[PDB]
Write a protein that binds this DNA or RNA. Structure first.
Lengths: 176, 136, 35, 138
RNA sequence: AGGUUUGGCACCUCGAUGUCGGCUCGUCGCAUCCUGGGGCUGAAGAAGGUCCCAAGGGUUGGGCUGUUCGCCCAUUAAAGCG
RNA sequence: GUUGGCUUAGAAGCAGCCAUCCUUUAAAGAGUGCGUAAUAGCUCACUGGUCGAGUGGCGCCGCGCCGAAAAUGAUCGGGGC
């Protein structure tokens, strides 16, 4: 995805916020710049894009930078973004969370009982040139019993899990 | 169920802690106004929660009482109140996410929480997700 | 023939809002209300 | 007061007058218990132990009985299968299971009162309604 | 919500604001006990149940207690609350 | 074929807990709906003819409305807007 990123000069963050912009910042071991976008813009992109897939910003002057969102802030009262730090990608192997998908239907319907997405998406060390969309979860043979975690994922090439490994990434439990 | 207690009333300023994010569950119930929520209330809500969709999914109650609410016996003045009597409560600043459901349809989920709100002595708002996280 | 928190018993129970009172009702005098 | 209507019934072929389904049902709904019953005999005489269905009325063809038609899906399903009543719970019980061939075949066989007609069609009907019961495909 | 109970506070009054109850005389409120209307009803009729308009006018005599209150007797359209 | 489940005395949506397949096209009700003894009927929750156009679904914002009953005569200080 992509969206204009107009250079932030450096004046009245609220002025923006209120006006229509959305303060942000892009950086890496090299770059570090003040940016701003547009609610409707950022929203329309993130809402679906989030921070799982790559975002490329269109700076007013040619520039086309490959990035991701490391963190966004909220105004507690009525969730609405306040700031955003953009990670200007390059080539060095980088960390990042990748989505997971739980397909099928593990035993848990006769008496009920529903799973519990214990870690929607996980971080795994990988080189940008390769960035899996989402990963699969072959779980469907476990009832109220145990759960899977850590190295129980067909983590493709360059997917050296970057966690413990031990992080319970899913679990099925009783109803009400 | 511990520590040395019968504490100071204290007050609820801005809700700098009134606004988390769905942590587990799928949908949720965020608070709009600040207040003290009596355990009596939590349950009275949670119960109706589960009870709304008998044999359903899971309910998560992120808020939790621990503040002792004292009260006098119907007399005058002479040392802190018998205290507790009725019990304890939790402090909610506008924005905190009190309850959150999961493992169910939105038609079932959403409508479920709506009821809860009636139990709580505040004004509420319902949320979905896909928002905040720490991914890239 | 009522006063609060109504969702419209039956569809027949159409919200009849006149004068000032918001009394919704169907064909059924059981499904009849008046705010 | 008397509202005419052909009576659609499932009954104990071999017998004829099942107290609940032909006593009340036929007689009062728009038919007759024991008479439609002996006509029943006339037929059920060689169909009666996996249950039999017939719609009986006083209709065109100027007469009384109407149409005898293949003992309903799911039921003849367990019928050939090998169980008494219903397997108490379908899906969340995944304990009654049958197979591909013998299935599609039994389909072919019962095929008479079968919508359209197709090998895969009847077979599929089997797997499906069978499931509906607890007669799941495995 | 109301300020009829029980309380809290201690602002006017201690060079004094006589404090339960009855009697007499009442006047106001509606959150209506009767009597006027009306909608529902799990309203066939006669009865009822419930809610809504609406005080114009009504709203008894005795037994027991200082009683207010109550419980009884005998009635009543009703034997209203403040 | 739906009238598959305990309960069938009756679920065979129009009892209640287990389904959510199939046949097959006008299309697709794994049936939201008036019922009794199920069942038996009613409307679209789908589609042609004209009709030829803005229509259904959620959501924040401004103002307002119902929620709103008391005691000597009432009124926003008044008139009147």
């Amino acid at each position: 995805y992509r969206l204009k990123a107009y250079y932030r000069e450096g004046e009245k963050p609220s002025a923006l916020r209120r006006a229509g912009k959305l303060p942000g910042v892009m950086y890496n071991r090299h770059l570090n710049r003040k940016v701003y976008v547009d609610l409707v813009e950022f929203d329309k992109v993130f809402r679906q894009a989030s921070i799982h897939h790559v975002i490329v910003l269109e700076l007013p002057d040619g520039q086309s930078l490959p990035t991701l969102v490391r963190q966004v802030n909220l105004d507690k009262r009525r969730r609405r973004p306040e700031h955003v730090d953009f990670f200007v990608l390059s080539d060095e192997p980088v960390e990042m969370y990748v989505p997971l998908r739980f397909v099928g239907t593990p035993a848990g319907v006769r008496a009920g009982g529903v799973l519990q997405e214990i870690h929607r998406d996980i971080l795994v060390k990988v080189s940008p040139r390769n960035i899996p969309e989402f990963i699969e979860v072959d779980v469907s043979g476990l009832e109220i019993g145990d759960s899977l975690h850590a190295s129980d994922l067909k983590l493709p090439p360059g997917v050296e899990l970057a966690v413990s490994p031990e992080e319970t990434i899913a679990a099925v439990v009783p109803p009400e | 169920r511990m520590k040395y207690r019968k504490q100071q009333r204290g007050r609820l300023k801005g809700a700098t802690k009134g606004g988390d994010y769905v942590a587990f569950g799928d949908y949720g119930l965020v608070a709009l106004e600040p207040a003290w929520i009596t355990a009596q209330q939590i349950e009275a809500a949670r119960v109706a929660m589960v009870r709304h969709f008998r044999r359903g999914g899971k309910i998560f109650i992120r808020i939790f009482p621990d503040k002792p609410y004292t009260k006098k016996p119907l007399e005058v003045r002479m040392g802190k109140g018998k205290g507790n009597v009725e019990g304890y409560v939790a402090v909610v600043k506008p924005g905190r996410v009190m309850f959150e459901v999961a493992g169910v349809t939105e038609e079932q989920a959403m409508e479920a929480l709506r009821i809860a709100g009636h139990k709580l002595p505040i004004k509420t708002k319902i949320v979905r997700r896909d928002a905040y996280d720490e991914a890239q | 023939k009522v006063r609060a928190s109504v969702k419209r018993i039956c569809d027949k129970c159409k919200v009849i809002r006149r004068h000032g009172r918001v009394y919704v009702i169907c064909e059924n005098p059981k499904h009849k209300q008046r705010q | 007061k008397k509202v005419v209507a052909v009576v659609k019934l499932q009954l104990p072929a071999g017998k004829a007058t099942p107290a609940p389904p032909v006593g009340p049902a036929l007689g009062q709904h728009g038919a007759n218990i024991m008479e439609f019953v002996k006509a029943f005999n006339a037929a059920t005489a060689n169909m009666g132990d996996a249950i039999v269905p017939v719609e009986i009325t006083i209709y065109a063809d100027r007469s009384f009985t109407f149409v005898t038609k293949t003992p309903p899906a799911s039921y003849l399903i367990r019928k050939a299968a090998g169980l008494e009543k219903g397997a108490h719970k379908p899906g969340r019980e995944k304990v009654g299971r049958i197979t591909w061939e013998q299935v599609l075949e039994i389909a072919k066989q019962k095929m008479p009162d079968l919508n359209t007609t197709d090998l895969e069609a009847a077979a599929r009907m089997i797997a499906g309604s069978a499931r509906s019961m607890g007669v799941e495909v495995v």
